[PDB]
Design a protein around this ligand. Structure first.
Ligand SMILES: Nc1ncnc2c(C(=O)Nc3c(Cl)ccc(NS(=O)(=O)N4CCCC4)c3F)cccc12
Ligand code: NA
Ligand code: NA
Lengths: 402, 400
């Protein structure tokens, strides 16, 4: 048989190497009949390891933060046992190897939101540090934040920390305020949002980084020289994702959304929720004045969203079906929405050929319109910040708690 | 003193409770505060069961967390998460610190833990208030409910739905089919639903049990002699809860709903979602014929639900604002719903005193109608089972 090391409850074969984690090798192993990854730590890092561990313990469990099982000390080494995972997000993306990209980012973000709410800033969020679970008994996989080596629990009352309190991060993923010549403001929770923002693009672009190839990454970060050109400019899903990512990687940290703010963004909406947003908007503006601020804002830049005449950009059965009220102005955002609402509401009553083009409510119906009008949701989400304070629109927008 | 085994440590003075005639100490594991369960050689087979099954199912937030087992010369030790109290203390201890955990949410969490166990083919067999634990507060002062005590659990093999009634534990909360050899059907997952059903009634009645006081409980369960008399039959919230609980404690196991089905019941709906259900229903049936099977089902026994004429049982300002629509029939369930749909939609346009009588959307608005018409939801839910398969009605009903 091959070699096996046993240190109390922890056991592993040194041939079964899984990778590394900053610096210390990581082996596949066993603990309490659970499959676990096992990290061996040298004497010089004992002090650091214990501070990572305590922080992991003294911080509530969350499904998207990595489960810590046990540590066993030894005359030569220290041993940290955690959840065995299938891969890093890096390996997932690099190797192109069921699991939805958006759901992965959502789970990563919830893990981040959870840490921030415990006044923990991660400081080293990157594809290597986000682990992807083994499938559970029902086949389901999830993303999980790991590697708490640069973490900082900020004291109660503090909302920031010093740039120079440790290592700044991993070159390529470090927010500009950590390394810029002038420290105009101390870093806060928004360092992780910048990193997260870069991670998002990495996943969506299937391997690219907003600030370019590895060699010049950090220098471009300081210059603000990003390019999000893996995102199609006339594609709904990419338009939406560009809108979010741009804010997440903004040079001014105060302009970056909080982790909870990011989770409210249309990027993460189901198709049903998108359709429901369009309905609520339509209903809300049904008896609104064409010269009042809401419709002015909704029609500002509207010709481009509509593509001049929206009745020319739909399938023929719908063109035919929309010859009933000629009050639907083909160059109106309002009326386009108004028409969507009408054909969602009266869907059951519509001709069989018309229902065939649109597709079934809610998924295929909404995609019919978002596929054909790629700026419609992004434009409508922005304009209708005017009504964000209203009860109806509170699920779609983010507000700091009372 | 202080005892130490391997990684487990505890002071034997700090006793939290007792068990299989087993002791539970407050203690320590891997620098965590934990509960330490000490078990005798007699109950090692059932210590191995708990441990194995907690390792399979403790990822769920409402299942108790399992940390470590240490075997000894005389004893065995299981370290699990330390909890504040049991459900029994939460219900019966006077002026208990609820700490934001509402009854309905407690039961939703309990049931969600149960649905998790069932999806792993694990049947609990001993669910009762003593082993539904209330957590320690988290960093934001939130507490939660958790399932525990997995000694009597059972893992069924794949495509085994049923298990043999073995000779359990303590009486009071056990389904009839698990005790009486008189029953034709061997027990299944629905034994836990029965127990859950008694637990529901216990929580919302604030101490009472559908089959009576301790002495007569298990005898009443065999006889099928329940009483749900703490649920008032003309209060909305109690009519909804009664419909659910009657099904959960049914004498025929097959009639009891599964845990996922329970979680879909109106009992657990927000005020917003109840309103949304009324809106969807009204929209669904707007252009249905009055002689069709859906409206026929909706109007079957409708005069009682509407209190003969719903116009005579609403506030005066709403009466006036509805006189506009001449076609609304006072004896019609459909038109009551169409009236609710209409005024939700046109709410912001409505007159000041009509808005003021209805109350704000969605919560006060929906309660206006449910308070005055306590069978409306329960009736409409039952009736619109006809459209349960349709996509629109996916959030409201359960599809296997
Ligand atoms: N396929 C993989 N599965 C699991 N792990 C992997 C790793 C890894 O690095 N694992 C790992 C381990 Cl074994 C132990 C500690 C930490 N550090 S920690 O900060 O999470 N931490 C210390 C306080 C308690 C938690 C760690 F990140 C790297 C590559 C692949 C995998
Ligand atoms: Na976890
Ligand atoms: Na748990």
């Amino acid at each position: 048989e091959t070699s096996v090391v046993i240190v109390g409850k922890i056991s592993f074969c040194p041939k079964d190497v899984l990778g590394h984690g900053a610096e210390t090798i990581v082996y596949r192993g066993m603990f309490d009949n659970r499959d676990v990854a096992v990290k061996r730590i040298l004497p010089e890092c004992f002090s650091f390891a214990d501070r990572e561990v305590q922080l992991l313990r003294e911080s509530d469990e969350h499904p998207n933060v990595i489960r810590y099982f046990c540590t066993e000390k030894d005359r030569q080494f220290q041993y940290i046992a955690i959840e065995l995972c299938a891969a890093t997000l890096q390996e997932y993306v690099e190797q192109k190897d069921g699991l939805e990209p958006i759901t992965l980012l959502q789970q990563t973000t919830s893990g981040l939101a959870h840490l921030h709410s415990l006044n923990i800033v991660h400081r080293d969020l990157k594809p290597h540090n986000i682990l992807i679970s083994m499938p559970n008994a029902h086949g389901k996989i999830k993303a999980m934040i790991s590697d708490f080596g640069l973490c900082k629990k900020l004291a109660v009352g503090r909302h920031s920390f010093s740039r120079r309190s440790g290592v700044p991060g991993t070159e390529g993923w470090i927010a500009p305020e950590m390394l810029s010549e002038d420290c105009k403001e101390n870093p806060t929770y928004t360092v992780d949002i910048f990193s997260a923002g870069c991670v998002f693009y990495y996943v969506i672009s299937e391997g690219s980084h907003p600030f370019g190839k590895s060699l010049q990454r950090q220098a471009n970060i300081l210059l603000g020289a990003c390019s999000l050109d893996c995102l199609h400019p006339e594609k709904h899903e990419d338009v939406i994702a560009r809108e979010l990512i741009e804010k997440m990687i903004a040079m001014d940290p105060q302009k970056r959304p909080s982790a909870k703010h990011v989770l409210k963004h249309p990027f993460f909406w189901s198709l049903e929720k998108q359709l429901q947003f369009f309905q609520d908007v339509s209903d809300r503006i049904e008896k609104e004045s064409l010269d009042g601020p809401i419709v002015k804002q909704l029609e500002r830049g509207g010709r481009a969203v509509v593509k001049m005449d929206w009745r020319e950009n739909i399938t023929v059965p719908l063109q035919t079906d929309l010859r009933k009220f000629r009050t639907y102005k083909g160059g109106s955002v309002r009326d386009l929405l108004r028409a969507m609402r009408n054909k969602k509401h009266h869907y059951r009553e519509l001709p069989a050929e018309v229902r065939e083009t649109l597709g079934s409510l809610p998924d295929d119906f909404v995609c019919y319109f978002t596929s054909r009008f790629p700026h419609l949701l992004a434009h409508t989400y922005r304009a209708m910040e005017l009504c964000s304070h209203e009860r109806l629109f509170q699920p779609y927008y983010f507000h700091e708690p009372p």
